[PDB]
């Protein structure tokens, strides 16, 4: 029900350093004006936002918990409102960027000849900014409006749809690779890659939304609802996902890996 605030400072710095290195390797190298890496840059920005917001909030509780109180009730509310708005915006932006990368890979593999004519730089950027704006609006609305309402149902349905889409796209890609592999051997690495992507995503994101499901259906029932008491370590998985997404997405690129 409580963890030391030292982890919320140790994760944030590491995630910030990793993501800033990722950003540096792209805004300086020749890996520019290609739609593949703009999505990686957006993902790095979203994960950096998650870590920064969580760390700033954590030191905010650290300073004001019993002593050195600034104001009684008004200031704390007016500050934590915007802090949680920032956290929500960063969460939704991270999920949307994670899904955009998968859709881009699917389009590259399954068209491969009409590509570069259906995904230009203008379209990639106009959808990146569209994702960011449409996620910021929703993040602010989910806080500065009625939280104690049907917002949670939407907030879980979007995650479930994103998870299903990611799984479907990556499973289809893996099955397509194997037919090619066969056509060759007649003259697994892919399973490991698919597992490392999907399992990391699920194991780092699902517990929080399961908790959100279990806080509107079985509040008083104790039949596996004491589960909804580890809420504070369900937010550690989000930070740990933020610290893995750059290691398994952009550092696997041969050019970026060679640059630094």
């Amino acid at each position: 029900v409580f963890i030391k605030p030292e982890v919320f400072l140790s994760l944030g710095i590491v995630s910030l350093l990793e993501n800033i290195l990722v950003i540096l390797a792209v805004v300086r190298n020749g890996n520019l004006h290609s739609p593949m890496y703009f999505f990686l840059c957006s993902l790095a920005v979203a994960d950096m936002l998650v870590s920064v917001s969580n760390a700033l909030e954590t030191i905010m509780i650290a300073i004001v918990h019993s002593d050195y109180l600034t104001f009684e009730d008004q200031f704390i509310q007016h500050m934590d409102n915007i802090f949680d708005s920032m956290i929500c915006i960063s969460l939704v932006a991270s999920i949307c960027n994670l899904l955009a990368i998968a859709v881009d890979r699917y389009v590259t593999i399954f068209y491969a000849l009409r590509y570069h004519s259906i995904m230009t730089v203008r379209k990639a950027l106009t959808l990146i900014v569209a994702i960011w704006v449409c996620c910021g609006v929703c993040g602010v609305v989910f806080i500065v409006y009625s939280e104690s309402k049907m917002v949670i149902v939407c907030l879980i349905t979007m995650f479930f749809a994103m998870m299903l889409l990611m799984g479907t796209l990556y499973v289809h890609m893996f099955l397509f690779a194997r037919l090619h592999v066969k056509r060759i051997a007649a003259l697994m690495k892919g399973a490991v890659t698919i597992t490392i992507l999907l399992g990391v995503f699920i194991f780092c994101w699902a517990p929080f939304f399961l908790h959100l499901v279990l806080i509107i259906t079985c509040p008083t029932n104790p039949y596996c609802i004491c589960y909804t008491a580890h809420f504070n370590t369900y937010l550690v998985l989000i930070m740990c996902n933020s610290v893995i997404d750059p290691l398994i997405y952009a550092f696997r690129s041969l050019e970026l890996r060679n640059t630094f």
Partner: peptide
């Protein structure tokens, strides 16, 4: 007013 690490720790 009790500060929360993040919103929705319960309902």
């Amino acid at each position: 007013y009790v500060m929360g690490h993040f919103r929705w720790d319960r309902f």
